[PDB]
Enzyme design. Structure first.
Site, PDB file in Angstrom:
ATOM      1  N   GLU A   1       7.840   1.786  14.987  1.00 28.51           N
ATOM      2  CA  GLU A   1       8.823   2.533  13.854  1.00 28.51           C
ATOM      3  C   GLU A   1       8.936   3.911  14.059  1.00 28.51           C
ATOM      4  O   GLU A   1       7.936   4.674  14.865  1.00 28.51           O
ATOM      5  CB  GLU A   1       8.213   2.055  12.559  1.00 28.51           C
ATOM      6  CG  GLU A   1       8.644   0.847  11.781  1.00 28.51           C
ATOM      7  CD  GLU A   1       8.076   0.600  10.639  1.00 28.51           C
ATOM      8  OE1 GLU A   1       6.963   1.242  10.160  1.00 28.51           O
ATOM      9  OE2 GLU A   1       8.265  -0.165   9.977  1.00 28.51           O
TER      10      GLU A   1
ATOM     11  N   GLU B   1       4.387  -4.707  11.643  1.00 31.98           N
ATOM     12  CA  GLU B   1       3.455  -3.526  11.763  1.00 31.98           C
ATOM     13  C   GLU B   1       2.360  -4.213  10.878  1.00 31.98           C
ATOM     14  O   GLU B   1       2.195  -4.493   9.685  1.00 31.98           O
ATOM     15  CB  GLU B   1       3.902  -2.492  11.160  1.00 31.98           C
ATOM     16  CG  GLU B   1       5.085  -2.029  11.944  1.00 31.98           C
ATOM     17  CD  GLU B   1       4.795  -0.714  12.840  1.00 31.98           C
ATOM     18  OE1 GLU B   1       4.083   0.236  12.671  1.00 31.98           O
ATOM     19  OE2 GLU B   1       5.688  -0.423  13.759  1.00 31.98           O
TER      20      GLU B   1
ATOM     21  N   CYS C   1      -3.468   0.898   7.252  1.00 28.95           N
ATOM     22  CA  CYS C   1      -3.718   0.063   8.322  1.00 28.95           C
ATOM     23  C   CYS C   1      -4.238   0.963   9.370  1.00 28.95           C
ATOM     24  O   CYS C   1      -4.913   0.458  10.326  1.00 28.95           O
ATOM     25  CB  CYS C   1      -2.444  -0.437   8.842  1.00 28.95           C
ATOM     26  SG  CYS C   1      -1.822  -1.497   7.668  1.00 28.95           S
TER      27      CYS C   1
ATOM     28  N   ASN D   1       0.855  -1.273   0.049  1.00 31.94           N
ATOM     29  CA  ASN D   1      -0.046  -0.023   0.064  1.00 31.94           C
ATOM     30  C   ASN D   1       0.835   1.317  -0.034  1.00 31.94           C
ATOM     31  O   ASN D   1       0.377   2.139  -0.533  1.00 31.94           O
ATOM     32  CB  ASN D   1      -1.070   0.149   1.163  1.00 31.94           C
ATOM     33  CG  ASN D   1      -0.029  -0.076   2.608  1.00 31.94           C
ATOM     34  OD1 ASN D   1       0.935  -0.607   2.728  1.00 31.94           O
ATOM     35  ND2 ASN D   1      -1.013   0.292   3.563  1.00 31.94           N
TER      36      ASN D   1
END
Ligand SMILES: Nc1ncnc2c1ncn2[C@@H]1O[C@H](COP(=O)(O)O)[C@@H](O)[C@H]1O
Ligand SMILES: Nc1ncnc2c1ncn2[C@@H]1O[C@H](COP(=O)(O)O)[C@@H](O)[C@H]1O
Ligand SMILES: Nc1ncnc2c1ncn2[C@@H]1O[C@H](COP(=O)(O)O)[C@@H](O)[C@H]1O
Ligand SMILES: Nc1ncnc2c1ncn2[C@@H]1O[C@H](COP(=O)(O)O)[C@@H](O)[C@H]1O
Ligand code: NA
Ligand code: NA
Ligand code: NA
Ligand code: NA
Lengths: 488, 488, 488, 486
Positions: free
Chosen positions: A462, A250, A284, A151
């Site tokens: 992150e 993630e 997400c 994505n």
């Protein structure tokens, strides 16, 4: 159509020895964008040995020498922002209005951020007594692997490679087979900036093969993965079975957006729109459970309808296009199945719900922006991540209820609240079980801000200073200057 | 023999509903120390529900209120050191000279260290622009699980529970079935200190059943495991297939002790002895590969022989005793098979190599202190962790060689160098692949000093400030005070 | 009547050699509480030699040994809270309802906080290259001096001595001639807790003699001063003319309380009351400029007057007394001079403005709670700190105006805003030029929170981790393991 | 050409009517006439800086970082041009100025540019209903007062953390060496620094420096210079508005040569610790403590090393020794050299001015070494700030430590030993902020540097110095009901 894309190992493109290839499509047109070579098990071994050799050179340079190389890569990324965004739009189907303003911009921001922190990476010194003291080193892990998602292809490659390289490691990156093209360009950019050969290698391939060979390789010290929950569980199993690796994941979420009773509903609707329909809902952190006070539910529904009518599907390179097709026809099929479950389970379809048809849409995997209301916590569309343009509007009566229902989920990625009230904003946010919390906004992810999931939505973080440190390992060293005493 | 020991859930002893029990043996006599109930699949769920309730109370307290409670537990541990050490000696076989001076003392040192750091656990604030800023909270993970090993039972329970409780979590601790007794005593001490019910629950059981139910439970956010490599791979695999949990692992090692040519060989022999034969060599950090310059090997062997002669085995409660039996008879059988592999591959037996016999030894799981020399890198006894009183001496010629051979292993836990030279000490240590490094000493593990393994010897660290933070999760909160702009 | 108080040097009370004494007065009665010996130059010299000896013992101890001694002192302070508070009430005139709930409670809180942080005091390690690295030590300064003020005598002594001792220094503390008694009690408590002799010495005396001798002494490394601006300037001058000391200063303020247009006026009035009349107005952080919107001023004045009428002056040991006399009669004259300037400059007296009279008050240094309104920025009572119970209410029309006026001062200690609006609270606070900012509250000073003044209100900070570090000095050490290359 | 002040992004005439001259120490000729900032000029620079600081602070952290990195790129490209101007003004060989002065100045600017995004406050929970967060806010306008030995490096080491923390700095260079500070101001503007953020006011310390220290709107002073001038700064800053002061003063740093030391290594370290920049360096190891058992060998080795020193044309490649910064300064160094003879020290070499073609017109002092030195001689206790090494003999380790520590100075220190315990053990007991083991003089941007005792207040470089150019604001958010006792 492009020339065949090869593997990038040790500073040059090189043929795969697997004999295998795959194709990446333009999801707007269905046309083959390029044939891409797939990395075999021996190719991965070559990449690891390249990475090991490069890492030693990289780690032996001064901190500022490493910083200057990464900042040169940033400068290249700034110059080629529009060209890289166009390739990303071709490969992903995301509008150029998105890719040229976010993907490379925020990817380079993180690289720029970490480039400047390299000299600040420090150990500690701990006095024990006059005759002994401890000091610590933050040493590179060595060779790490990143497994990207489709994505945000180049943004993920930058968000994983930037802290890894800044921490002194070499990274082998395996892009998603849906979207491999921008990762290969980035590898070229790094070398042009002076990155030593081998420090960033890119191995396109299928997850079942190239990804599995990376997770299984015994000389890889860490895996960082962004993707779907299922592919994550496989990576974690094969990495557990193999050499003991630190894994960072993630994954997705079903993030709540809580609209307070004192909130301006135009602001709330704008936030909800941006939290559900950017990148055609394939994000997400999207706020796909929108909780609205019963007294304002109807007015909010109209405001959403007004804004959804403004969504402009069309030519992905046109300036006013703000909505693109989904990345593939199989992905749209899953989104369409969730929409039908919403209809069958008694949710009220407020708008959308069907594929798009007509010239320019019949060849891509378009779904109309979709909104369900009258939703209940037990419905499938409320409980599961759809990863498509599907908003669920839920009604609530009191603050304790909405906090309980917002938290009543195994997902934990993001959350948000809309309210002008000082106490309400902080009080509610502090009780939500999510790693990324937005007050009166949505979606902004500064390089300084650690981001990642609670519970089943991820492992680790992150961005931020802590992610630079997480790509190092601590060595504790005790200097004993006194006479050692043995009891034997 | 003791009354059947029960589970400890929510501030009280409670019977298991599993219908299953197991036994723990005194390794000095073969006698059954006690029958112990095993936590069933339903008992784990009860402990999780208890821990969820207790954690909420515990996290709602002030930082200093939590600190005072943990410091009270410390005071109880100091007062009951001798009583606790005796139970540990009965359960583990370690001499009282060790358990009374190290196990509880260093366990309580870590609890005391973390108790004081609770108020300094802080988040961050980051200005983005005049109209927006970010702040972070270091929030408890919630319910965490610790799985303990049998070599340092109460010290491990404290090293896991101290940071977990200090960070605001509740821990469910599963002791090793070989040595379950001291962890249950610790739970009563914590409650007596004022710890809320549910914050520290102890569920004895077997790894295959009780351990797996904990690693599988969807509402446990983190697992901290100390044990052998094999069981660790299982834990990581089951936790992967299950809820996506944070993991910490402290596994075994094959740590090298590099004696330099300018080393005092008396100091080197004393360090080698302490690195191999404390706790009868059942210590993960032990320096079981002793690298000695060829030119000094014969003299070093003589000095080692002298120190083995001073070792005083016997009644574990005698003051002069400094060597004990292994923790169990099955573990002794494994250690004997390693010893036979050393003879069959041609390692020269310098001393030991057999069980101990005579009155007061024929009933204990005793192995003589054993030293192999003329050892080579490919031997089984040099390649694999034995976890017994077996030292391997390896000759080397030059520094580059010994660094390569020291590092040529999948293990990465500890390392050490003996040298009076400033440059040699740091230069060698900086090139060794190990998380715990001792210069001119061995074995000291201050509460301030993070400890853990490289490569296959573990994931994450214990002790130090960083481990308090690793039992929290970061929540990033963006406050947007400017007008939110939607592109739709 | 108390016995004559001696100097406290090296763990015992000792007679001054100055031949000079002074008296401390009970401000509620005028009676002499005690005669107190004054330290001369030779007394200060002896204190430094004592401090130098004790600091070496104290710093040679382990970090946790220092921590345990300070926590023992905390336990004694909690046990003696009521006794210490009653003495403080006698010496200062503050109601027992304050001293028993705040002064020692929050003094001991800071000592307890720093006691736990001693083991986390850490240096750093910086790798330059393979052949060279840097590490840093945070070493004690040695002997430091604290000069206390009279409004919070024992709290100031703890807030200064706690970080100084926790950082490994010895402190010589000089209490205010007005309030010397509790500092001598604290010295006894430290010895009973196990503090080495000389680590905390107390030298009562006058600023022009005892204070000046300390600020001039060549062997004092740092001065920490709380007091009035004029005395501070003297301290800074003597310290510069002398040995090159680091100075820290917590001086007065004229802090603004900004009432927003959307604030609840009952909350605003309660905050303003607590910001002006606690400790009879003798607080450096008091919000003595209360900014109220013009349209709400009349209603705010009514609420203030209703609350001022609830203020209960009387027996300082009575549970319901919440207002006390000023610390001394000379101080009352200064406050009365300011009140008269308010009248003469045309400010409107709303209540108070005179001494209190009658049985129980005639012998005390009492001033009625005083409120002026219709104040302008050029008035003396608005521009200068009064340190008495005198509130100035100022009207304003818009947010930009009140920010300018709030900031248009040389003082910079504290500030506050009353508003339920998220954006307004943070936006205003971020623009105020003060080190201590309270939103919808006033006066709370947690141990974890650094506090101090902008601009002329102070230098440096107290409390928080940073203040522990500020009582150490950094030593940087480079280890060069490569060959040194000379250009000569 | 008459050098002027630099205020708000342009050169401007001083309103003092006063000027001064800077001499090329190699020729005695006047290099340039420089205008001196007066009292009205100081108020101008501060008012400009206040306006510029808000623009600067309002930018993003990365926007500030990019501007500072652009200045670095300009400084690198102009290293040789700037180094030559430095050589003319200071008398330091081009071999030094082109390799150290701008290189290490830019390194610190480059270092701090990257750290701006990591400057963070803290968040502390108190209870469910209240929490605290802190902001690290700019101080506002700060002033730097530079020394003459490293003019541009000091300007960069002071301005880099100040600007990186979001402040504006007014820099007053030494009257001896004002020229490179004005080039730097130009470079900053070219890089995009907002006008007013770095203003340069050349002048005399008795006037221009005092007006900065007395100005009520300057929040912090960072000073590098001699002890006497610093005490005057601190007094005037005391008598005036309450400022944070930072000071980097002189020292009498000890260099301790251990018994197991190689004397070739020790002699090299001692040469670089005494004779670099013609010995005008505050961190110089002017007291070289050598074991008696080796003194004679070390002396031979010093004489061997001192003989390779190549004085000459300051633009020549092989030149490694230059004149002192001024002829007046030379007299003080010679005054100290005469005191060693009068105090009984044995002159191993140097001790006079240099003569002949190319040296008679310069401010040269020969490299000087005394031995048979005692702890009581003036030359051993006081900073000379010239090329004068004092060799002192010792017998045991405790003595050398106490003697090393038996000073009011505390700036630097060093030990030469291959032994692990002696290096750490000795260094941990020395009272100095900057300690070198088996080396001397390296001062990485990452490494905090500054003096113990009378040798300084505060620190420069390292992350901590970035924070010391900010002030903490603590903010409590009380979400519970506030309780009044009235
Ligand atoms: N079994 C696997 N092992 C490793 N990587 C995989 C595996 N399955 C998928 N991947 C990769 O994981 C990323 C995300 O997968 P998905 O969520 O299925 O799009 C892509 O790069 C996939 O190719
Ligand atoms: N498969 C497993 N899952 C969970 N815990 C286990 C497993 N196997 C062993 N354990 C536990 O791990 C600890 C140490 O394992 P071991 O090294 O096998 O003694 C003990 O508490 C065991 O009961
Ligand atoms: N010149 C001075 N030097 C040192 N301390 C002083 C001086 N003047 C006053 N003090 C002390 O400073 C503290 C507060 O000063 P003041 O504001 O005058 O109450 C008291 O302990 C005074 O005795
Ligand atoms: N009294 C003073 N006030 C302020 N600056 C001064 C003062 N005296 C000297 N300076 C300056 O301080 C710097 C170094 O001082 P010096 O040690 O005398 O070279 C130069 O910029 C001088 O001009
Ligand atoms: Na594609
Ligand atoms: Na047992
Ligand atoms: Na009094
Ligand atoms: Na000059």
């Amino acid at each position: 159509r492009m020339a065949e894309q090869q593997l990038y190992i040790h500073g040059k493109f090189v043929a795969a020895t697997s004999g295998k290839t795959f194709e990446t499509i333009n999801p707007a047109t269905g046309e083959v964008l390029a044939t891409v070579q797939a990395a075999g098990r021996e190719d991965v071994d070559r990449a690891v040995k390249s990475a090991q050799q490069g890492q030693k050179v990289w780690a032996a340079m001064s901190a500022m020498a490493r910083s200057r190389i990464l900042r040169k890569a940033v400068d290249i990324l700034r110059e080629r922002n529009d060209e890289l965004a166009r390739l990303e739009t071709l490969d992903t189907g995301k509008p150029l209005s998105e890719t040229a303003a976010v993907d490379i911009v925020t990817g380079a921001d993180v690289l720029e951020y970490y480039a400047g922190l390299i000299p600040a990476l420090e150990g500690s010194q701990i006095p024990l007594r006059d005759s002994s003291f401890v000091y610590t080193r933050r040493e590179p892990l060595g060779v790490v692997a990143g497994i990207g998602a489709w994505n945000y292809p180049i943004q993920i490659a930058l968000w994983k490679s930037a802290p890894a390289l800044a921490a002194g490691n070499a990274m082998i990156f395996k892009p998603s087979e849906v979207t491999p093209l921008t990762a290969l360009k980035l590898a070229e950019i790094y070398r042009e900036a002076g990155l030593p050969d081998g420090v960033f290698n890119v191995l396109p391939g299928i997850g079942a093969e190239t990804g599995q060979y990376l997770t299984e390789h015994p000389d890889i010290a860490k895996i960082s993965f962004t993707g779907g929950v299922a592919s994550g569980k496989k990576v974690m199993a094969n990495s557990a079975a193999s050499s003991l690796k630190e894994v960072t994941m993630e994954l997705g979420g079903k993030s709540p957006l809580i609209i307070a009773e004192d909130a301006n509903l135009d602001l709330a609707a704008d936030i909800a729109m941006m939290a559900n329909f950017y990148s055609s809902g394939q994000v997400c952190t999207n706020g796909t459970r929108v909780f609205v006070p019963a007294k304002f539910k109807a007015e909010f529904e109209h405001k959403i309808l007004e804004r959804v009518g403004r969504i402009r599907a069309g030519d992905l390179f046109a300036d006013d296009t703000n909505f693109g097709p989904l990345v593939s026809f199989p992905h749209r099929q899953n989104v369409l199945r969730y929409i039908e479950s919403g209809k069958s389970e008694g949710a009220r379809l407020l708008c959308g719900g069907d594929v798009l048809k007509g010239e320019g849409f019949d060849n891509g995997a378009w779904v109309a922006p979709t909104v369900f209301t009258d939703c209940t916590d037990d419905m499938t569309i409320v409980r599961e991540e759809i990863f498509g343009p599907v908003m669920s509007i839920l009604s609530y009566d009191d603050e304790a209820e909405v906090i309980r229902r917002a938290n009543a989920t195994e997902y934990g990625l993001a959350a948000g609240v809309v309210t002008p009230d000082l106490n309400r904003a902080h009080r509610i946010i502090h009780q939500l079980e999510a790693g990324i919390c937005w007050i009166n906004s949505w979606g902004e992810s500064p390089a300084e801000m650690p981001v990642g999931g609670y519970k089943h939505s991820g492992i680790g973080r992150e961005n931020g200073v802590m992610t630079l440190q997480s790509y190092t390992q601590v060595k504790s060293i005790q200097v004993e200057m006194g006479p050692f005493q043995s009891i034997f």
